[PDB]
From a paper:
Jingmenviruses are a category of emerging segmented viruses that have garnered global attention in recent years, and are close relatives of the flaviviruses in the Flaviviridae family. One of their genome segments encodes NSP1 homologous to flavivirus NS5. NSP1 comprises both the methyltransferase (MTase) and RNA-dependent RNA polymerase (RdRP) modules playing essential roles in viral genome replication and capping. The NSP1 RdRP exhibits a characteristic architectural feature commonly found in viral RdRPs, known as encircled right-hand architecture.
To gain insights into the structural characteristics of jingmenvirus NSP1, we conducted a crystallization screening experiment for three variants: FL (residues 1–915) JMTV NSP1, as well as two N-terminal truncation constructs, namely D55 (residues 56–915) and D307 (residues 308–915). Although the FL construct did not yield any crystals, the D55 and D307 constructs produced crystals with flake-like and stick-like shapes, respectively. Subsequently, the structures of native D55 and D307 were resolved through molecular replacement, utilizing the Se-Met-derived D55 structure as the search model. Due to the significant similarity between the native structures of D55 and D307, with a root-mean-square deviation (RMSD) value of merely 0.2 Å for all superimposable α-carbon atoms (with D307 structure as the reference, covering 99.5% of residues), we primarily utilize the 1.84-Å D307 structure for subsequent illustrations. The D307 structure exhibits unresolved regions, namely residues 359–361 and 388–389 in the index finger, residues 504–518 at the tip of the ring finger, residues 779–785 in the thumb loop located between α-helices 21 and 22, residues 830–836 in part of PE, and residues 912–915 at the very C-terminus. The active site is situated within the interstitial region of the three domains, encompassed by seven RdRP catalytic motifs A-G. Even if compared with the most resembling flavivirus RdRP structure obtained using an MTase-less DENV2 NS5 (39), the right-hand structure of JMTV NSP1 RdRP exhibits a tighter grip with the top of both thumb and fingers domains (primarily pinky finger) moving inward for 4–5 Å. The NSP1 RdRP closely resembles the RdRPs found in the Flavivirus genus, which includes the N-terminal extension (NE) and one-segment PE, both of which are characteristic features of flaviviruses. The JMTV PE exhibits partial disorder, but it is characterized by a one-segment structure that closely resembles the PEs of flaviviruses in terms of length and structure. However, it is worth noting that the linker region in JMTV NE is approximately 10 residues longer compared to that of flaviviruses, and it forms a cofold with the palm domain. Remarkably, the quantity of intermediate products (specifically, 4-mer in the P2-to-P5 assay and 4-mer/5-mer in the P2-to-P7 assay) generated by NSP1 D307 was observed to be greater than that of FL NSP1 (when comparing lanes 13–21/22–30 and lanes 53–61/62–70).
Numbering used by the authors: 307 to 358, 362 to 387, 390 to 503, 519 to 778, 786 to 829, 837 to 911
The structure:
């Protein structure tokens, strides 16, 4: 289907497509396009090789006795590689869908982007490019290199980073981008959902230029940027206490629905924040890339596997480091706008509104992380919001997941029923105080801890993370202590913070949750026995047998390293 016209947004620099001839030629397409997509425009294809699931040996073997109940009563879910046929079918089903570019809400959205940018600049100043030390802290060392870099034989981002060759490469990327004819600008893809990512040099560049957005979010009361999961429940509780009603709605396929119009506003805002005029040019040129995404996706026809070069318009790619910060900001702005219009908040009050949301003052609160949000309102405003705010997000194509288009919002009045960041939050006692701590299906928890000496270091970090965040769930505390008992001391955990250490102890956990008002293993709380069902493991004979055999399993899994016994910190 032909693309609609684009939105023309007053006061914003248009995101003109770059000259992509150089980056297209880098993909070495062989054949003219077949054209079987409805939105993406196929430019060509080439014959490929079928592209690709492995469980961590340490975590996997420790939970092996529970695999059956976790697969039968929970959401563990396992694993075969996705076929090219299945990859293209999922692309067509979920990604090959035109964003809604044309609607009447850009002028008011722009006003709020401008308000937020002005508040950040007034309070915190402009945004510098990341330093090398800052980039080293944020890179995923296991990330892929990308087809355009595969012939340099680095293996992964970590090895590429360590080599130091990226320093010249990112400046080569910068110069070509600013010229209007970029190199290495075509997205690679892999299935896990389709992940889209630029080559490693491009990714280090975009991290350097846009990585500072997280620093502003750390200052915002509506963001959880930089904060650990163990803090989120208390923030949900605090926000609810100030309001009394919550609306928690997910958008189906958020990344696929973001329009070039919204990207135009993102770029507008971020260029406002830049330290110097060259930085603003760099940001604007990156968004000229983002808004005109070219990507290679696999398919299979008559037994022949193709690498297909496709061109879209708008949308958001997942394997882009700024995506989290940009999604969070755009989610905050679109949600605040729809709420303010629906509740009739006058536009002259919008600067105060955005300040109060940022300062957690007043009778309206937001919590936002990427495409996930909870809106908190008094009951009276919640009813007004629930009755019609969906019309504005529908206008923008931000259709809500799993409900009818014009279904009124569900108004949540119990803090324990609010889903945020894929968890709910339950009250847990630490000594004589209560903190709200995260729960979700334990099959999901265990699966994420299993599906990736790097392997041992990775497992050990999963155990440290599980102990800090899920010690209130007994099976999670047990698995964590077992992980820490089977993984050796002295590994490089930082390559995989406050608690990321071999000598982790309760005092560190109490410092994070109660600021050290409590102490000891005995004041780390548990959920009530009566609630150990449903999303949590029922404590039946299967569970008690696993617990009985864990000490032996730990001893059998240990090898040549130095280990410490952690299971004695519990039953
Ligand atoms: Mg939510």
């Amino acid at each position: 289907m032909e693309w609609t016209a684009e939105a023309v947004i007053e006061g914003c620099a248009p995101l003109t497509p770059l000259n992509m001839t150089r980056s297209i030629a880098e993909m070495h397409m062989e054949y003219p396009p077949l054209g079987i997509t409805r939105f993406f425009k196929e430019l060509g294809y080439k014959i490929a090789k079928k592209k690709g699931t492995r469980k961590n040996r340490f975590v996997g073997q420790l939970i092996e006795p529970l695999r059956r109940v976790l697969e039968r009563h929970h959401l563990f879910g396992a694993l075969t590689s996705t076929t090219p046929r299945a990859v293209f079918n999922m692309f067509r089903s979920k990604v090959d869908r035109a964003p809604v570019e044309l609607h009447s809400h850009y002028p008011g959205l722009k006003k709020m982007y401008d308000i937020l940018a002005d508040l950040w600049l007034e309070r915190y100043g402009s945004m510098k490019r990341l330093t090398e030390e800052e980039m080293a802290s944020a890179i995923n060392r296991r990330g892929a290199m990308g087809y355009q870099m595969d012939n340099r034989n680095y293996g992964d981002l970590g090895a590429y980073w360590d080599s130091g060759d990226w320093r010249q490469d990112v400046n080569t990327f910068k110069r070509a981008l600013l010229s209007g004819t970029p190199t290495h600008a075509v997205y690679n893809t892999t299935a896990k959902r389709i992940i889209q990512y630029l080559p490693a040099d491009a990714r280090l560049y975009e991290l350097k230029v846009l990585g500072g957005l997280h620093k502003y979010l750390e200052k915002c009361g509506w963001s959880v940027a930089g904060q650990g999961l163990y803090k989120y429940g208390d923030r949900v509780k605090k926000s609810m206490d100030a309001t009394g009603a919550a609306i928690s709605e997910d958008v189906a396929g958020w990344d696929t629905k973001i329009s070039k119009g919204l990207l135009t506003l993102e770029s507008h805002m971020f260029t406002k924040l830049a330290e110097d005029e060259e930085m603003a040019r760099e940001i604007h040129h990156l968004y000229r890339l983002y808004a005109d995404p070219h990507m290679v996706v696999q398919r299979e026809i008559e037994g022949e596997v193709h690498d297909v070069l496709l061109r879209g318009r708008g949308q958001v790619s997942s394997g882009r480091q700024p995506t989290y910060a940009a999604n969070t900001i755009t989610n905050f702005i679109t949600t605040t706008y729809g709420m303010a219009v629906t509740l009739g908040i006058p536009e002259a009050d919008w600067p105060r509104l955005i300040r109060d949301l940022t300062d957690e003052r007043g009778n309206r609160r937001l919590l936002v992380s990427g495409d996930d949000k909870v809106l908190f309102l008094r009951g009276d405003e919640a009813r007004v919001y629930a009755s019609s705010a969906y019309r504005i997000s529908n206008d923008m194509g931000l259709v809500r997941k799993d409900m009818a288009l014009e279904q009124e919002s569900e108004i949540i009045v119990d803090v324990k029923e609010i889903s945020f960041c894929s968890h709910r939050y339950w009250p847990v006692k630490y000594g004589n105080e209560i903190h709200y701590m995260p729960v979700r299906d334990v099959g999901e928890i265990f699966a994420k801890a299993t599906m990736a000496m790097t392997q041992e270091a990775w497992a050990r970090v999963q155990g440290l993370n599980m102990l800090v965040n899920y010690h209130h769930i007994p099976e999670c505390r047990m698995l964590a202590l077992a992980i820490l008992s089977v993984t050796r001391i002295g590994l490089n955990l930082k390559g995989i913070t406050e608690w990321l250490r071999d000598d982790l102890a309760p005092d560190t956990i109490h410092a994070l949750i109660t600021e050290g008002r409590t102490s000891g293993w005995d004041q780390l709380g548990y959920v009530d026995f009566k609630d150990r069902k449903g999303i949590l493991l029922r404590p039946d004979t299967n569970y008690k047998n696993w617990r009985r055999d864990l000490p032996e399993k730990v001893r059998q899994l240990r090898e040549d390293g130095q280990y410490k016994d952690w299971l004695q910190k519990m039953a």
